[PDB]
Design a protein around this nucleic acid. Sequence first.
RNA 1: UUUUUACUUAUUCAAUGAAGCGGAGCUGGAGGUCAAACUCCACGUUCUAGCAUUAAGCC
RNA 2: UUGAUUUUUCAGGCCAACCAUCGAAAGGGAAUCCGGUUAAAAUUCCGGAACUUGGAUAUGGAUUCUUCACGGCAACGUAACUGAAUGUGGAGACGUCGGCGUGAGCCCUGGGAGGAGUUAUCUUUUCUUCUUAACAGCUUAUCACCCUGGAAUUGGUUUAUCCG
RNA 3: AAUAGGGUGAAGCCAGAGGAAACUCUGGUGGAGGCUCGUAGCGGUUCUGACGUGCAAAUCGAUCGUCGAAUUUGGGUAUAGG
Lengths: 52, 96, 77, 91, 249
Amino acid sequence: YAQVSKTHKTVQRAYGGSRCANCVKERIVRAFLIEEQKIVKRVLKEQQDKEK
Amino acid sequence: NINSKLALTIKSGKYTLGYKSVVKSLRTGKAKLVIIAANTPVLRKSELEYYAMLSKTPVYYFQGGNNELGTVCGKLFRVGTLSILDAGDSDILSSI
Amino acid sequence: AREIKDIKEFVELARRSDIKSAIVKVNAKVNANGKKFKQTKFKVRGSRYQYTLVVNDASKAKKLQQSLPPTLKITNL
Amino acid sequence: TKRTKKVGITGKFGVRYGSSLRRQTKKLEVQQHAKYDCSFCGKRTVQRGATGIWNCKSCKKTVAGGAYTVSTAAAATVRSTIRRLRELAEA
Amino acid sequence: GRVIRNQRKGAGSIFTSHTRLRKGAAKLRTLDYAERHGYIRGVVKQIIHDPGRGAPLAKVAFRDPYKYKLREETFIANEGVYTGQFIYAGKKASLNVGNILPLGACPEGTIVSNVEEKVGDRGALGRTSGNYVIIIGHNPDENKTRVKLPSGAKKIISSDARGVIGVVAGGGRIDKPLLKAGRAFHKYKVKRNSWPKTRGVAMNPVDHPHGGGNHQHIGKASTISRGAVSGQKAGLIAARRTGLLRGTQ
RNA sequence: UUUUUACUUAUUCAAUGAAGCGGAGCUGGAGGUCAAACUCCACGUUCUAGCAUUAAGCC
RNA sequence: UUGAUUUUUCAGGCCAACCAUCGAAAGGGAAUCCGGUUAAAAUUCCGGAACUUGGAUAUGGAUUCUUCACGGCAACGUAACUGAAUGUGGAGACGUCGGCGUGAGCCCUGGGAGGAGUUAUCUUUUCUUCUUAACAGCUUAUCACCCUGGAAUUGGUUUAUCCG
RNA sequence: AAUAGGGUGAAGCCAGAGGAAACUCUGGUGGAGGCUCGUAGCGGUUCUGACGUGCAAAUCGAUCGUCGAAUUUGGGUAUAGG
Ligand SMILES: [Zn+2]
């Protein structure tokens, strides 16, 4: 692998030569959805920090 | 009771079975209700209800697994999720 | 050994500064769908590789041979 | 046709080891070679690896189980016992 | 006479454990600030077979609280633990199968495994397949907890000692007969050199206290004093009773 | 002199790449407040096999 | 590890879990083949043709005025096409048996071009030569994956019944 | 690192037949087993054979045990005289 060009050892994508396409797709969706719910759990917490 | 309501919709109304069909029906705005089986992966589940939030669609959480959700629909296969396009003779949309 | 297909690339390659010598090989072949024809292989010896151009046309070979640099040593086989 | 009247999977042992030991082997060895329903994907694709290891071919979920069954009766009791005691503590 | 097989094991030449294929020592995490004050979350990456062990092991990845690094722990897999499960360890961890909690944080009747004898020894009790520890009661004034061990013994442990909720996976292993000498050979091929065993009564008087005679027989009582010396302790050492166990004990 | 149990520094056991110990104080949740705020608890992480590293900001 | 300094001084920036060493001519492991040659050496010599590692280094190409390239819905493609500390992974790297499939070498065999044998008779006959290395380019695959689509009258499918 | 060629035919699977059900029967397929016949191999039963100042300080011949595992084996390594 040291003596071959980079296109042979990677794929033009995030985590190209490290993760497969489906595992990168699942990381992206999981990162987006989980972080979206983090905002929801924060605004909801602030809703219970002013009435209860 | 909802099993009886859901069975009537399959007999008389319109529906799609399967994750790929449900997401298409949420994109097109043709979904009236989304039913998700209990053993559906949470990542797929939390994504279906994000699509429904954008699409302004109610979500019903079936209590059984995809084996039980499939047999309620009169199918001999497993149904992880489904969308109701047209509740016909049933009143499932008014109950959920 | 690398094979060269473009005749224009071969003449530009034969005038590289590291090119020691050239070989002109004549093969009496037959296409089996006709009769005898004379194939010519032009072989250029560079530092790393020997470069071969196969010229199946007996006339394009003669024109190509006089198109090589006059300084190259040419061995006729 | 039916090939063996009663030995079943233990017919590989021939006449050796004693009938009582072979019928005791048959009970647990049918269980360890069975296919179980996956609690994650719903398919009947769960098979044993080594003891206590049960893999699903479809969804590639591995669960820790019993030596010869995916779940022992003792584990099922603990699951409900832990579930019950959790409810009281969390009200 | 000669040095008997009991005594040759302590030198440990051919009697050490065969440990090439073992997958690491099964331990809890080192007790740190997160477990003492809150909880830390890890994810189950693998559930693997450990040669020489009936219980499968779980590989759980935690974050290092102080440096950018992943820490892989080797836990004893409780039954029901699956790959991709989140494992919570600490004082504030919830009562779920696979979570690591201090003993005082568990109500009476909680089934727990890989329990610490002492705070921070990373697990001593109930580690084999199908085994567990039952929490009997608490003594909050003295900060002590009563537990029942797999042998039936009652023990008093610090309430800060940790354990893993559930039963050790792989239980029921003993229910199946081995049926063959070869099965025991393969069983001990990855444990240690203790099989097969020659009966001492079948040896010569040099080899064993039971050897010799014109019939195979022990000749003297096989119950041996606790105060006997090495080379004598062959048989039933400090036996309170002998014979078939009849009735309750 | 004998029995018991208090101390920790001798001694002994264990762990860690000696990372958050002990006390007090900030903040809330409470006791019913009979001076005046004393006592107790907590004090940023729990649908998901994602991410977290080489400080932003304020003075 | 850098920026250096020519001030042969330095300035610092990161880290020091673990890490003396020995232990395999059958384990792991950078890289070579063919033809010829001696009385006796050859993957070592000769001829030709390659390869790896370390170092130095210029030219061409590539890239930049939207500074660190484009194309494809996608799987992904390419002659290239910044990337420190630190981190995460992969390869190294792995039992045994059973049948199945593909390849290679060998075995068998037809025509043709040669050479040898038998031939009282018979035998378009019996035997034999007809080869192609490492390496370079293009092309080539089970499996796996992507897009489309939405399936009971269930269908696809292996020698071995698994898949939706 | 090594271990011809056969026999038998366990689970699982396919099809057909019978039954109200609980279930049963048949034909294939499949290829299990410290299974079996039997080479190499490993061993060493009997002739109480040969030899017995030997080919040999343990061999030779026939016969025999076993032959896919508790198998056979090279090298490295550990254990040392009460
Ligand atoms: Zn599954």
